[PDB]
Structures are given as structure tokens and as C-alpha cells.
Amino acid sequence: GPQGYASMNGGTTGGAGGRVEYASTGAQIQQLIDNRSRSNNPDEPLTIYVNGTITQGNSPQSLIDVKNHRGKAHEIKNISIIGVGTNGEFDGIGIRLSNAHNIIIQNVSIHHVREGEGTAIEVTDDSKNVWIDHNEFYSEFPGNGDSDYYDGLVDMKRNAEYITVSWNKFENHWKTMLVGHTDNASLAPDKITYHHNYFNNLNSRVPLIRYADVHMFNNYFKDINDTAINSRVGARVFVENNYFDNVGSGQADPTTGFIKGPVGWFYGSPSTGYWNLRGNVFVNTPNSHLNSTTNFTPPYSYQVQSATQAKSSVEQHSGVGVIN
Numbered sequence: 001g002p003q004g005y006a007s008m009n010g011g012t013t014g015g016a017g018g019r020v021e022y023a024s025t026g027a028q029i030q031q032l033i034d035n036r037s038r039s040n041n042p043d044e045p046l047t048i049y050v051n052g053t054i055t056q057g058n059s060p061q062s063l064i065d066v067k068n069h070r071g072k073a074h075e076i077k078n079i080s081i082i083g084v085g086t087n088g089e090f091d092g093i094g095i096r097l098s099n100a101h102n103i104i105i106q107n108v109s110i111h112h113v114r115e116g117e118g119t120a121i122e123v124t125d126d127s128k129n130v131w132i133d134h135n136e137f138y139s140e141f142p143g144n145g146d147s148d149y150y151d152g153l154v155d156m157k158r159n160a161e162y163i164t165v166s167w168n169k170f171e172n173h174w175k176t177m178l179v180g181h182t183d184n185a186s187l188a189p190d191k192i193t194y195h196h197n198y199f200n201n202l203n204s205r206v207p208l209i210r211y212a213d214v215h216m217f218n219n220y221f222k223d224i225n226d227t228a229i230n231s232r233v234g235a236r237v238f239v240e241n242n243y244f245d246n247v248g249s250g251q252a253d254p255t256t257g258f259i260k261g262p263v264g265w266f267y268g269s270p271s272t273g274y275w276n277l278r279g280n281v282f283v284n285t286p287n288s289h290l291n292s293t294t295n296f297t298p299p300y301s302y303q304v305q306s307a308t309q310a311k312s313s314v315e316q317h318s319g320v321g322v323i324n
Contacts, residue, residue: 002131003302004193004215006164012129014080014104018045022084024052026059026093029081037069037076045078050088050108056115059093063116067098072125076100083107083135086321090120097160098125107324109136118151123160123189130160136169136319141201141225147174152205156212157181160189167196169319174203180210183233183269188212193298194219196310198318199228204266209235209273215298216240218310220318221247221262221285229263231273236296239263241279241304243311250286261286281307 006012023029029048036046056062066081068074076099082088088108094116097103100123110120120137123130137153153170155178156163170176176199180188188211199206199221206221206228207214217240221228224247231237239262248261256272258264262285265272274294280287305313 002133002164002166003195004164004300005162005191005298006129006131006193008191008300009129009162012102012104012131012164014102014131015045015047015078016080018047018078020047020049022049022051024050026054026064029054029064030060033066033076033079034069043077047080047082049082049084051084052087053089053091054093055091056093063093064090064095065098066095066100066103072098074099078102080104080106081108082324083109083320084324088320094120094122096122096124097127097130100127101129103127103130104133105135106131106133107135107320109320111136111138112150113139114150119153119155121154122152122157123155123163124157126159128160128162130163132163132165132168134167134318134320134323136171137173138169138171139173141172141174141203147203151175152178155181156189156192158187161191163189163191164193165197166194167318169198169200170202171198171200176202176205177207178205179207179212179214183210185211185233196314196318198222198314199224205230208232209237210269211235213296213298214238216242217302217304218242218307218313220311220314221245224248227260227264227266229275230266231263231275232265232269233271233273235273236276236294237263237273238276238296238298239280241307241310243281243307244285245283247285259286259289263290279307
């Protein structure tokens with residue numbers, strides 16, 4: 001199972017120990033979800049192996065809706081969506097988790113998502129215990145120059161909690177990851193871990209964090225054009241043993257005045273978040289101006305490599321075609 005926050009609150013096992021289905025179109029995936037939701041046993045664990053390319057053309061809605069058929073007031077539980085080999089591909093259509101509990105998304109590539117939420121994975125409406133592992137997410141950067149043509153890669157909103165994002169590649173994209181979509185503390189997610197991801201050729205939001213407590217360890221950040229970790233409105237982020245290469249422009253942000261770099265407070269919200277920095281390696285990345293501004297450490301056990309060991313592990317073992 002997952003390291004970090006998805007291991008808490010009872011853990012995350014997804015669809016393990018129930019039914020197995022193989023799907024190669026969005027119609028099959030959506031029907032499996034909805035048919036189960038309408039059954040006598042709606043929480044029976046379900047693993048869906050994805051062995052074809054899921055698209056707008058072969059899906060009945062503009063996103064893959066991991067949501068109870070009785071709408072977001074009701075929970076949907078105990079699902080894994082796992083790619084087969086390098087064949088689990090979502091081209092132009094993303095996944096949304098809404099009041100979704102104990103969910104694994106693993107070994108899929110999701111990319112060029114413009115329609116729907118315009119986001120590869122949206123985790124929202126009070127979802128909890130979600131593990132996003134060994135995937136690849138991308139669009140274009142700079143592409144056509146319109147940062148909003150695509151929306152997010154992995155966004156968390158509306159009280160999503162206990163989430164681990166591990167071993168993924170996020171590449172070639174403008175607005176990479178959100179944690180909290182608005183300055184409303186009562187809707188903020190909390191308790192997110194990011195580890196062993198590759199964040200490469202991105203403009204910003206790595207992540208944009210509002211309010212939440214977040215642990216980022218053993219990630220490899222590379223070629224990030226504007227800024228990476230943006231901690232806002234009382235967020236606390238423990239940034240531990242990560243490797244950064246060519247991250248941030250070094251220019252002062254026109255809104256907050258903060259030097260654009262691997263961590264800080266940028267662009268907006270009425271006040272800063274905080275960051276605890278330990279063990280990071282910064283190459284050609286502005287960093288001498290940084291101080292730790294919180295002692296925040298997460299409430300769980302974990303194993304952590306050095307930054308340079310992590311860089312090599314991420315190079316070798318992140319993304320698809322590794323675990324399945």
C-alpha cells in the first residue's frame with residue numbers, strides 16, 4: 001500500500017479483494033461504476049484493469065465520473081483503476097473522484113485533457129483515502145501559449161483528505177497541481193503526501209497549496225519555468241530530501257515580491273503559507289534566500305532516501321510500465 005497520508009484513516013486498498021473487470025473504453029468504465037452503484041452491493045471492491053485507450057469519443061460523459069449514481073451526497077467506495085502494461089491510456093479525458101473513498105489510480109497515462117474539468121485527475125467533494133501511483137500526466141508546455149487551454153494535471157479540492165501521490169511523472173504542462181481551489185478555509189483539502197514523483201518542464205503550481213498540511217519528499221523537480229511549491233493562506237509544507245534542477249525564474253513576484261523559485265508565496269491569496277525545509281538539493285535553483293518558517297512534520301512513519309538517491313530512483317522507476 002501507500003506511504004504517507006493515504007495510509008492513515010484506515011489505509012487505502014482500493015478495489016482489492018472483490019471483482020475484476022477489464023475495460024478498454026470509457027463507456028465500459030462508466031458502466032461498470034454505475035452498474036455497481038445501482039446493485040445490491042454497491043461497495044463491493046472493484047478493480048478495473050484498463051487495456052485500451054479511453055477517449056472522449058468512446059466515453060458517454062466528458063470525464064470518467066467516479067461518483068455514486070445517487071450523486072455526490074452518497075459515497076462511492078473501494079475501487080482501483082489500474083493500467084495494463086503501457087496500454088492504460090486516457091487521451092483527452094480525465095477522471096473525477098467525487099465523495100470517493102478508498103480509491104487507487106495506478107499505472108495509467110492521462111493527457112491532453114481539455115474537456116470536462118480539463119484536468120487529468122480531479123479529487124473533490126470530500127473524497128478520502130486516495131492513492132495516485134505510477135502514472136504519467138502531461139499536456140503541452142508552452143504549447144500554443146495559452147496556459148488555460150488545458151487545466152490541471154492533479155487537482156484536489158473541497159475537503160479531499162488523506163491522499164498520496166507517488167511515483168508519477170508530471171510533464172509538459174502549465175498549471176500542474178492545485179490543493180484547494182479558492183481562499184475558503186472551510187473547503188480546503190488537508191493531509192496530502194507527494195513522494196518520488198518527477199515534475200519536469202512545467203510552468204507553475206507544483207503544487208499550489210492553500211491551507212493544507214502537505215509532505216513532499218524524494219521528488220525530482222526539473223526545468224520549472226516560473227515557480228514550483230506555492231504555499232498560501234496558512235498551508236504547511238514539509239519539503240524534505242527533494243532534488244531540484246533549474247527550478248524557478250529567480251525574478252521577484254509582482255504580487256508578493258517573493259523570489260520565484262522552488263518554494264515560497266506567489267501570485268495571490270491574502271496571506272502566506274509556511275514551509276519546513278530539510279535535506280533538499282538545489283542545482284541552478286534560487287535558494288539562498290530561503291528559511292524554514294514552520295517546524296511542521298507529518299504524523300506518520302515513512303522511509304526517506306537522500307535527495308540524490310531519490311533522483312536516481314525517480315528516473316528509473318517513476319511512471320507507467322513499472323508496476324503492472
